[model samples]
Structure formats: structure tokens, C-alpha cells
Target: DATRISRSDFPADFIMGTGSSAYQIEGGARDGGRGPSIWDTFTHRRPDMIRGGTNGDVAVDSYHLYKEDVNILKNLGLDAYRFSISWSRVLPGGRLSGGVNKEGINYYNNLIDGLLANGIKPFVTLFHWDVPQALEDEYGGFLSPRIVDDFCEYAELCFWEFGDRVKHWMTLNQPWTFSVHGYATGLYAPGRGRSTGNPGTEPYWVTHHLLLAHAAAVELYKNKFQRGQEGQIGISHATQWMEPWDENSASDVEAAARALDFMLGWFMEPITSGDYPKSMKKFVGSRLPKFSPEQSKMLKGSYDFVGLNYYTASYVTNASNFSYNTDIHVTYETDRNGVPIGPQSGSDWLLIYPEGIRKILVYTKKTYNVPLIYVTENGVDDVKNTNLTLSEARKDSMRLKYLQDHIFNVRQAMNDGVNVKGYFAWSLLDNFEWGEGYGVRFGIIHIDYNDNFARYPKDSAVWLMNSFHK
Candidate 1:
């Protein structure tokens, strides 16, 4: 039943691919004249924050084995490869004036050319939360307005170098995750929240700067590169579709909407309407940053498409607390009463609810009036256990079912008039998982850490090939 809906069921032009971030892959942390990123600082200084105390120093050796990755994509018949460009990689010092690394540019040029030669399009994300360490030290990175010009200059360099080949560009990946995790929770790189303990204001400042940086890049691209390169640019958001804990309770119903407003609308609202959500403004008040008239105009209609990374759904109930986590006045649960919303994944936070994908797609289309949409990241992870045999690791029945059902949901959303254009799995190979480190695997292709970073296609990858291959 899982394979009942094949690739031919969707439109021929509907792009299908897999997604990965630079910090999670492309390991060569100290190689190729590369400078440090916030992740490097976070992983090195705060190893306790990561599971197994693992970092991405090597990261499956993708930097050296990218050709093999391109071959893997060709084998699967994917149309595109969604990957992020490391800010510190190309511009090692986070600014052109700080100096450009020719080796860094050559590495990406080789990777992009390899993908193109294999007939796989490169869907590039300019920022995936790996802020260059130099900028962080100078002005606290995204916490200050100074980051706007620095980020724009970095963006300009990326576009200038790779714009012709990389037609599909995402300026930022999950700005919410970057702002909240990096500034509010302090569970991620830079660990500012741990020291500041002022989640209320710091996260707002981070998001504000991130938005301005995104808009500045978009403006630069529109004025300088779009006509010349004829490319499309956008931002990716991460969210879990919210459901009221008590369906009959109006308070809970409103709470569910508020949860979405905090998670998705925090970033989506600005790009769509030039302001924060009405709920956010009412709830956060002065804590939420305001956009100047020029900034507001630049933010509005800045994107050509919207990228969404939907993983699961949460049950919402009205709650009262302080700080950014409780700012929404909602408590999130995976269950209602004694019943779980769906099955759980290796990541306890992820509840497998296929229908949530469809609901989110339609809701985004209706709420934002987005002309084009891409499901940029969607996949479940499995906890890594060294005791397990290689064959056992390669089965991945859960991931197979997850992709099958979620892809079915995407098709259903399209039928309901959601202008969905593409779907990319969370990853192709398992690598560094940030805070989780290498303890969990999200890849359809398994990477053998014991061996020389060997690659083995999981059952889900075989399923992907079967369904999508011509």
C-alpha cells in the first residue's frame, strides 16, 4: 500500500530531490583554507551539548567524496539536490574585504559542475545557520544591524560566483530555528542564550537582523543578478502543523492558531504582509521588532517562492508563561488525553502524522497566498546503534513508510489546489545532526562510520529509485 502512489501520479514537472545542509555534511572543517563557523565554536567549546559528544569535523567526508554523492543522486534519478552554502567556506572571514578563499570557491565549483554534469539541478541555500565565526566575534552576528551589510556582501559573492548555474536559491533555511535555537535556547552554536538568559529580547533581535539580511540579499539579487541569471530565490521555514488539544474547546482552537503564528508566521508574515502576525504583535508587543517603512517595503514580496520543512504536528492547549518558548501562551503535546497523535520517531519530538503535511500545504496556500511552494525538507530519523548489524540498519522500513505516506499527502494537497511545485527529502546520506550529532540518522543512504565512510542505499532509497526512476 505504501508504494501504491508512484512518481508518475504527480505532475511531470514536479521536482523531486533530497536536501542537506553544509554544516551537517561537507566536512573539511579545517581543510581547504576554510575558516571557522559558529558550529565549529559550539561543537568544540561545548561538546557536552551534543549527543555522544560528536562533532562534524569529518562529516562522512562528503567534501572529498562529492562526486560519489552526485553519482548517488544520478542513481536515484533525482531532479535536484538541495544543499546549503557555508558562509565561512567561500568568504572565510564572513566579508569579501576579509579576503576570499580561492580553494573554497574551487571546491563548490567542482561540486556544482559535477551535479550539473550528472543532470541534477543544484537548489542552493545561502544560509543554513552556520554563521561565520569572525562576524559573530565582531558584532555578535545576527544580533546587530551590522550583520545586514556583511550578510548582503556574502550573498552578493555567492550570486556573483554561482548564480548562473544555481538558478534556485534559498537565502535562509529555517530562520525561526536559527533565531530560536541559536539565541533563545542556546542548545545550538554560539550558545548566547545560555549566557544571556534573555530569550525574550535576544531572539527578536536575531530574527530582525536575519529578516533584514534576507531582504537586503533579495534586493541585491533582484537589482543585479535576476535579469542576468534568470534565477528564483526564496527562504525555507520549519514548522509542525498544529492541532487543538481539545477540538471542541474554542480556547484551545485559538491556541493552535497562535502556535502556528509563533512558529511559521513569525517568519512567513513579514515576507507576505510586511509586518509580524497580528497575534505576535498583540502577544509580544515591544519585544517584537518593528520594520521601518523602507525595510517593510523590502520585506514584502521579497521571495519568488516559499520553502517549507514540515516534519510533524503538535497538539496545542492554552498555557501561560514567560520567555520566547511560552510567548505564544500555548503548551504543545504529542497526544490528546490518552491517545498519541501518531507514532514517534528516533527524535522524540517528531510524531509521524502524514495528514499534517497535507493540512500544512493547504493552510500555507490559503493563508499566505504563495504562488509557488517547495517541501524542501521532509524525512524521519532513526537512532544510531553500533550493535545493530549493517543489514538491520539498511532496512529502514519506518523511513520508507514515512516517505510514501508523506508524498501521498503532498499529492492530496495538490489536488486540493495548493500550488505545490516540489518535494525534497531531508537528506541523502546521514552525517552530523547538529545537537544530536551522529547519534541519529536521517539519510535514505546509510553512511558507515566504522568503515571508510562507506555508503549503502537503504530500502527507502531503493523505493525512491523504483518510484521515481524513468
Candidate 2:
């Protein structure tokens, strides 16, 4: 029954979008009633936390430049715009008990109407790793369980306001990033700097609260908003395919599965199946929190679609020598994992692995029973050095190749019976990349950081436009 298929065979309704987070793009830090977020606090407290000591203080200035950005999307023939609503922007203090900011509401309202006017469906992500600094200052933010009610109130407000035009909403972007990077590794915003500090408590508790918040939001939508609003809501889980260095070896295969189960399955399993994977408990012991009977039903199958943000594939081994911390460690090593030691990208953590895209899609479909999947974020970053020239910018062939390969993988997954519904490239324009700052360029359009953030369409943008037209 296996038949070869081409990209042309995809369904017409299949959406193509580009994604950008609020803190990563919009740079009017003090404008429109927006309050300081945890990222603001982190970047200010430790300027060295980000590369080049640069902060998102002036980012891509998308807040002021959204009209131009919409033109870019309209030109690209994009069907959807995957953008996040900054919590602190809407809730200056990150608490519903504190009043909602009307200016923040107007910003998103305009953005949503603009996308609709352009015939682009709006996919809104409620949270994209930017917690209100006020929350952090109050009670450790995500570290505290108080986030559950706070997030629910925020989501309810958004649903009531934007649910009419925006049908697809994601509760959270990537809790793994928030939990692991922000809490465990201390590399991200609101950095706990807990490398050697209290290992088991903060990270585990943070994840517990994250899941609770997600479940709470989903329940609120399903109960109060779903029927009347006619919207689809889910959480965007970030997953990179993990392949065993030696597939034939039992240990390697088990290690690879464990990695996937812990990372991807850990979040998805509970929402879809109503129970955490047993494999997780075996690895992390009691750190994996349990859901109450009522909570189990609320959390189970809480999504209209499972938004997946996948990029490169990881290679895993049975060994644990890659331990960066005592509580958390990765058995996967990129260099030793059969990946080609190709030229480096702009970001040190990312490597170009095209085929891994296909592998990840296939694995996700198989593991998650072919849930309605959306590639929420996928793009490669190119290095930015002073020596970079127009030739380098024009000949960003690597990014084009990466896109082609990944798009092909997506088509292949569709042919293989995966219920994939959309693909959103990592970014619409070059913006602030989290801790890496502005050094990594993942945007298809080249941005002149010094010159009013002028966005120039690179070869990749042209290729994407052409490909979409075809």
C-alpha cells in the first residue's frame, strides 16, 4: 500500500505560516501598557547572560513595524501567522486580580484584524516564555503553583476577546524550555542559576505547575468558550527527533526511546492518554508529578491538535557522560551521533540536519497516533559576524536547502497518513533570539540591526515565496 507521493499532493487547506514570539520580536518594551517580563529582568540583571551583551530592548521593533511585517506575510502567501501574546503586556502585574491592560488588548486586536484583512488565519500562542516580572518578584512565577489560576484567567480573557477571529490558539509554546532551560540549566530568562543549587525541587515543581496551567487553560476553553467561540486550542510541544547512534543495539534503542518518551511523550502522553508514561517514572523517579482523578480527566485528550515545534534530530547513546547537571542530563551527542560535521550555524546549539525532519515527523505520528500536528516553529540560524558580506546574505543556500528538505519531509509525512495540518517556519523576520541575542539569524528576511531594523528578503524568502506560489 506504500505509494510514492510528491509535495503537490498536499491538501489545499494545509496552512503555511511563520512564527515569532513577543519578546523575540516586538521591541516597544515600555509601550502599550506592557510591563517588564522575566526576560527583561534576566537580561538587565545579567547582561552577559545573552551573547554580545545584547538585550531585546530594541529587538525587531515589530510592535511599531507590524504593518510592514503583515505585508511581508501577505507577499509570502502565508495562510497563517503564528504569533504570541506577551502576558506582561496584557497583565502588567501578571495577575488577573490586578486589572487587564487595555493597550495590550488593542495591540493584539489590531494584529489579529490585520492578519484577517490579509486573508491570513491567526494562530495565537498565549505564552511564549515571557512571564511578567511582577510575578517573578512576587512568588517565583512558574516555580510557584499560583501560576495555574493566573494563566487560566489570562487565557480566558484572550479567548473572550480574540476567539471570534482567531480559531487556533496554543496555550503555551514550550514548557520544556521554560522548565529545563529557565529552571534547571539557568540559561534562559528568570534564570534560577540552579546548576548546583536545589536540584530536585524547582525544576520538578515548575513542570508540575506548567502541566496544571496547561490543563486548566484547556478545561476553561472547552467548558466556557469552545462551543460559542468555535476555536481550536492546544499546547505547542517542542520536540527534536532522537535517533540511536546504533539502531541495532538494544541499549541504544532503549536510550533513544527513553529520551523521546521523557521529552516529547512526557507532555503529550498525559494530555492525550490521561496518564504519564511509565518510562518517565523509571528515569526521573518521583519527580514526575501525578494527576488527581479529576485532574486526569481534565488533562486527558485536551487538545484539538498537538502543535509540534521540531527542528534537528538528536542522536542518543546508552551512556550518560553528557551530564551537564546532576538531576538533568542528555545521553545524546550531536558530533558522535552520525551527524555530518558540517559548517556551523549562527547558533552554537543548532546543527543543520535535513533528513532528521522526516525522521521526526514519522516518529511523532507513530508515537502520538497521528494527532493533528502543526509545525509551530522550524528554521535554521546563520552566523552573524563582522566579515559577513552581501554575498553571504544573498547566497544563504543552506537555509533554503534546510527549508526544502523539511518541506519535503512534511509532504512525506502527509503521504504516510500523518494528520499534519500546518507548517510555520521559525520566524517571519530576523528578531531577538532569546539568550543568543541578535547573533543568530533565523529569519528568512535579513535584518539590518543598525539601520532601523530594515528587513531585506534573502534568497530563502524568495525561495519560500516562489515555492508557495507554485
Candidate 3:
């Protein structure tokens, strides 16, 4: 097939932008009334856990340089910018009674105001895996149902402060990643799995609370703020499409389906239908938590939209075990036979598979009937190689092509009737990539870590500007 894709190929209302999270991009971890997030403590105590032993204490200095980042977004001609608000930055104590940090409020207000002033729409995520250590210390964070009220109050504060200007709000980003990485594998913040013999139970409990928190925030928005501010709120799910490793085997096919149910449907089902997926209930058995009928009512139809952060696909086959990772009775890989599913990226977990994007969009649309959708985060990462010259570093043809192919697949899904309305690349600039630290870059704009974190447009940025920016 011979074709070219551009912004004009989609609906006029379709949005195109790039996204970053507070901890990943915003530094000033302890500055301006900011308190510690679980990430800060995790990296500080377990530097061995992160690549290059790096943290976000001064992550590309975005907290101070956001104006320049906003200018970069404007120059790239992006329609919007998606970023998260650091929880502890605003509520240093992590509770309504703990007191609000007006300085944190001023920082986000400045950032939001800057985006709007520059003619860019701001899409804000309330949480992106940075739990205030205060909350974790006080009530074990998401492990306790107490987070619902604390999180709801936090959401209320955000709505009260920034809701009018920030129209697109995501209650949480990648709850699956948070639960699995943080509690099960112990790879992320507030790392927990060491003493727990059953890594399975904590993650389920954690996600249950996360769901309650999300539902509570959405309910608060719909009741107190949405009508007045006219803002839409949703949650961002980190998703990867699963393909059967042995397509001919019924068990393998069933395994792949079960994997999807556990990953995406785990959260989607509770929000859309007010219960965990049947496959999850059957397999996880007594380990999974049950929602009260009242909580179930609040969760159903909780979003105005659904944000999907899709990166790659996995080939799944049946397996047997009893932990969170094994609960679905499946194992996945990036390849089948001697053949790879797609080109490998700097990150081991990511492989380039553009068609998977369309597959996921179609699957989500057909199964969930989501009212609206956004490809909130999608981009490939390149290994950080400092040996190269600035000129060499800026040549990101692989990422440029990946972006083009994925955008084409998105259009194809829309043609097939998926109600997707936007695509935001994973990031606007190279910043700290959690655990991976700065060892990987997922940015269209290259950041010069050696020189004042200078921002330079990589080839992908130029392509995005010339091809899709309008």
C-alpha cells in the first residue's frame, strides 16, 4: 500500500499533542513547598534499583524551565500538552487537614497559565505514580481504603484550583503499572514485595483502592466541578496488545484473552460494568477484593473519556503459577518462533508493532463501547548514547517512522469506527524515565544533559511539526 498520512487525514476535532508526567519532567522535588513522593524516597534508598542510579531531583529542570518546554510545544505546533500534577507538591502532608502548599498551587497555576497563554490546551493527570510519602506513612497509601477520602479531597483541591483552565483531567495514570510495579514486582515507588510471600494479594488490594479513589474523584468532579467548569475527566490505562503465541492452540488463544482481561479489563470492567472481569474473578479466586454495591454504582460510567497509553504488543501463551504476574496463567514474549514480533527498542519490554495500535483501538471500542478515547501516550524510546555529537543525537529517524506508522494505524482504527479523538506522543522532551532513569530517551525534542539541559528538536519533532501539526 502506498499512502501518506497527515493531521488532515483525521477529523478536524481530533487532537495531537505530547505528554509528560510531573516526576518524570518536573524537578524541584524538594523546592517550593514540595514534599517527598514515593519516587523520591525509592530512588534515594534503592539507587541500585534504577538504571544509572539516577533520580528526578532535577529532572531536566522542567519545574524551572517549563516556559521553555511550553514554547517548544508551541513551536512544534502541537494542539495540546498533557502533564501530571505531583501530589505531594500540592498537599505536602497528603491530607486535607495537613494543609495546602500555596507555592505548589502557584507552580502548577503558572504552568497551566503558560500553556493556555501560548494557545495550547492543557490536559492534566492528577496522579502518575507519585504518592506522597506522607500518605504512605500515614495509612500505607493505596493499601488502605482510607486513600479514597484523601484522594477525593486532593481531587477536590485540584478542581477548585485548576479545573477551569485545565479542561481535560485524568484522575490517574496507568493504575495497572502502579499496582504491579510498585506492589508486586517491587520495581517502583514504595516498593513492597520483599516480605510478602504472595505478591498477588497486595497488588489486587492496591488496585481495588485505586479504583475506589478514581471513582471517588470522578464522582466529585461530576457533582461539584464538571458542570461549572465544563471540564472532562478520565483515567489513563497503560496497555499492551496481546497476541496468541500459538494461534492454532485454543489454550494459547484463551491465555492471550485472559491476559488482556487481567491487564486492561481489570480496571475497565470495574468502571464500565462495576465489577472485576469474570476471567479475573475465576482465576484470582478468593484473592481478589469485592466492591460494595455503593462503590459499584459510583464506578459505573465514571469517565467522560478513556486514555490509553499503548506502547507495544506481546505474544502470550499459557503458563501456571500463583502470583499476581501468574494469576492469569499466561506468559508473554516479544517474539514467536525465531522471529521477533517487531523491532526491539532500548527498553526491553517495548517492541515496535504499529498495527497493534489499531488492534487495541478496535478491541477497546468493540468490547468496552467507551464514549471517547485518546492515545494519551505512544512513542518509542532510544538508548541514551552520550558518545554521539549533538547533531548525531538529534537524528531520530526510527522514532519518526514509528510515529508515522502508529498515527496511520490510529486513522485506520477511526475508519473502522473507533471513537478515538487524539494521539499524544509519550513525551515532548527527553526527561527522566522512571527506573530506567535518563538511560533511555522517549522524546521528540532532545535534551542536552551535558549543557543546561538545552532543548533541541530531533528529526521526529520536525516530522511531527511538518506532517501533523496544524
Candidate 4:
């Protein structure tokens, strides 16, 4: 006998939303008196760092077409919206002591009010990897310990200004990605290529500062603002669910758990329990910094909830005995074990793994008893090189399947009692995809980048709309 499934499987209060980051979707760039972000400088200095040598100079032009974009949200029947604020837009120099940009304030104010008026809750992220270039130049952005106070001041301003309407505030989005990918691997912005010579030293130091900054902002919101604002605050960390390459092998299982500890548990264990994983300390040695007693208290249990941006799962194996950089010798295998790899249709690095959603939720619940969990970003990117007509764009059956299966996994987790809260699709419209630039399309609404930024609803959008309507 086959079991039946339907929309009724999800709770009535289950939230469905869309997400976008300021630098990726909003293309005001030099307009509105905004200062340069690290991304802006990175793309300029090494245009080739991004695919097609493309930059987010125009993007979806959400800076100018935000109202129209909101209309798309209304049309999609989304219950909420998750967007990040550009630090440079608010404080041109990235310094809280620096004068605030009134234009930036007004723009966010209008966006928040509009979302509220439409009966859609807004989840605002304070940072989404767009550090003001001035700050990076002034000191070293997240590399500097001084970023703790600077970030707090910037977050305080956001709290004072938008706290009245925005109830869900994310202090930082994907610090692991920002620090590891951007600074360590040079796969992303502020492109500092991996230090083969120094190995983990630079990346480790950068991560230390990022954690401090996140803790500082969360502490500020908790101790200073939450009482008056009545809001929830947390940081979003990217988690790649890892499984053992050989499930029957003890070494393989230990390797898989160590991979998770390095990727997710490193940041999470500290935030949820006030201490880094013992495994991380043992493995990384002095490369991993130690927190003072007071600092440990500040870092532990600083979040109201945990925001997970999970994509796919990977199979990990032991690499300690392998030849590699001594200072940074942690090694793991990927794309092995017959698992699917990403960009199923046209995008890259987007392997479709529906069961991963369930695995991630279960792991988080078991590890931290995370009272609240939100799928902050999860979507497939499509390749856009074909000369396909706009009408043909609606043929994104692959993406539709990805979303449906993942959401179904969420339902399965809830049925299993994981205390999951909401799901926000990776993007609302196709725009700049960081290092991938305009080549990767992760949006439900397809934008004609060459044609006045007109947004066309892909087939995936229609499918999502009908699914929501039902």
C-alpha cells in the first residue's frame, strides 16, 4: 500500500518565504551615497575572480525596483521575506561612529513598512558578507579584533531604527562561508587565496574575529534591545550534512563526524553550549584560539534560535595520514559515494539531495536541541547560457522537484518532532550569485539582465504558486 501526502502534512502556521542578500539582489551600487563594500573592491581588482568577469553593478536593480519585487512576493503567496542589509549602505565607511546615511535608512524603512502592509513578516539579516571596503582597508574587516565593537555599533543602529517592525533579526549570515570561502579558499570575495605556506593560521585567525563579532552583536541585541523590541536574534550558519564514505568502517564514521564538527559543530557547539567542540580543539591545536571565561559566556547560548542554510550532503573520509599541508592538513573527499553533484540543470555546485534536509534537522535537534530552526536559504541555480526564450524559462522542472522534495523532507522532520520553524527559498529573482556572477540563475522570477531588468516568472514560479494556492 502507498501512503498519501499532501500540503496538509505541514502545520497551518508553517512559513514559506523567499530570501535575497543586499549585494546580490539590490544593485544601487554607487548610488544612494553608498560606500564601497569589500565585494565591490574585490570584483574590481580581479574581475576574473567572478565568472564571466561579471559584477553586481546592476544585478536585479532591486534598489530601484524593490516595490515591483514585493509585488512578485505577493503574487507568489509568500508569507515572509528574508533579506540582508548592506553595511556600506547604512554607514558608508563601515564605522558606527561615522555618520549614518539617511537615504539608506529611508530605503530600508520603506521596504519594511511595505512588507508589513502586505501582511508578510520580514526577517532581516544584519550582514551577508558585504563588508564595507573602507573597514577592510582601515584595519582588516573580520580579520581585526576591533570588528567586535564596530559591528555592535552598526547592529545597534539597525536595532534602534528598524526594531519596531522587524521581529526576526539575524546578526550574521554564514560566517563559515564568509571566512572559509572568502578569506581562506579565495573562492569568494575579499579573495584571499588559500595559504599553502601558512595553512590554517590565517583562516583560523579570521574565523576567531568573525565569531567575536557575531557574539558581540547578538549580546547587544539580547542585553540591550530585545527587552524593548521583543524580537528574536541569531546567526545563520551554512551546514553541509556529511555522511561516512564507508558506513561500516569506524574510521570513516569518525571522519564524517569530525567533518561535521569542523564545518557545523565548530560554530554551533560554541553558540549553543559556550565552548568549541573538544574534537576541534584537539585537531586544530593552537591554530584554534582560546576564549576567556567572560568571552566563553558571551559566545555560548547567545542565540535565540539557529538558522541553517543547508544545501547538500557529502561523504567524508579520513585524510590525516595523507600527504598535505602540515599546518592545515584536514582533508575530506567530496562528490564521491555516487552522490549527485550540483547545478542539476544549468547552475553549479547545487547537487540535489532531498534527504539531506531531514538529516540536517535531525542532527541539529539531537546535537543542540535547537528550540527553533529556520531554512534560511536553499535553492538550485540554473545555467543561463542557452538562448532559450522567456516562455521556455518555465521549463525548470528540475528546480521545482528540488524545492518540493526538500520541503517534503521538512514536513517529515516536523512529523518526527524537530521543532522546525520556517523555510525561505534561496532567492526571489535571478541576480548576481557572488563569484558565479550572472551566469547562475537561482531565482523563481527570471530577470532579463540585458532587457531593462524585466522579471519573468519561470515554470518553477508557477508551480510554486499553484502549490501554495492549493
All candidates' lDDT scores?
A: 0.90, 0.80, 0.90, 0.81
TM match of model 4 to true structure = 0.94
TM-score of each predicted structure versus truth = 0.98, 0.94, 0.98, 0.94
**Lowest summed lDDT over 10 consecutive residues: which window, candidate 2?**
321-330
Per-residue lDDT tens digits for candidate 2, residues 1-470, read 11222225678878888889999999899898889999988898899899988887779999999899988888887678899999989999899877789988999999899889989889999998999988887888887888899999899889988898999999989888787788767889777746343445566677778888999999899999999988899888878778777769888888778788767777878887788777766666776677888888888888888887877776777655211244323466776545443445666567677666667777877877746888888888875666777567657877887787778777877777778888888888878878878887888888887789987888988777766742
Error of 1 at 230 (Å): 0.6
lDDT score of model 3?
A: 0.90
Across 1-470, the per-residue lDDT of candidate 3 in tens digits comes to 21378877888999999999999988899999999999999999999999989999999999999889988988999899899999999999999788899999999999988888888999999999999999988878899999999999899999999987888999999999999988888888877775443477999999999999999999999999989999999999988999999889999889988999999999999999999999999999999999999999999999999999889998999886357887878888776878999988777778899999999999998889997999999999986577999888898978888888898999889889999999999889888988888989999999888898999999989888987877
* Candidate 3 global TM-score: 0.98
Clashing pairs in 4: 342-350, 342-351, 343-347, 346-383, 347-382, 347-383, 394-459
Q: How accurate is candidate 1 locally (lDDT)?
A: 0.90
Where's the lowest-lDDT run of ten residues in candidate 3? 191-200
Off by over 4 Å in 4: 1-7, 195-199, 320-348
